[PDB]
Amino acid sequence: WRTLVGVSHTNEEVRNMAEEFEYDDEPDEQGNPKKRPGKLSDYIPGPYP
C-alpha cells in the first residue's frame, strides 16, 4: 500500500483504501485469534484464500 503514495494517490487516500480490508493480528492475552484493519505497511490482498 505504501508504494502508491506520491505516485498515483495521496497518503490520506491510501490509508482509507487499506482500512477497508481485514488482516490477522497478534493473539490476545487468552491466545485467541484476532483481526485488525490494514495499514500502509501491508500488501494488497487477493480474492482467494
Next chain:
Amino acid sequence: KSTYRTPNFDDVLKENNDADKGRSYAYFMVGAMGLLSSAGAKSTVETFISSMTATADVLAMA
C-alpha cells in the same frame, strides 16, 4: 646520408612552440579527465554503501 642530417618533422610540429602555452593546454585536458573520473568514483562508492542501509520495508516499521 650522414647521421647529422635529421629527417623531416615539419608536418607534425607546432609552428609556435611555447613552453607555458603548450603545457597549460595539455594539463587542462588531463584535469578534465581527473575531474570527471573523481566525480564518477563518488557515485560508485555511494551506490554500493547506500545499499547496506535500511530497506524500504524495514523503514516502514519505525
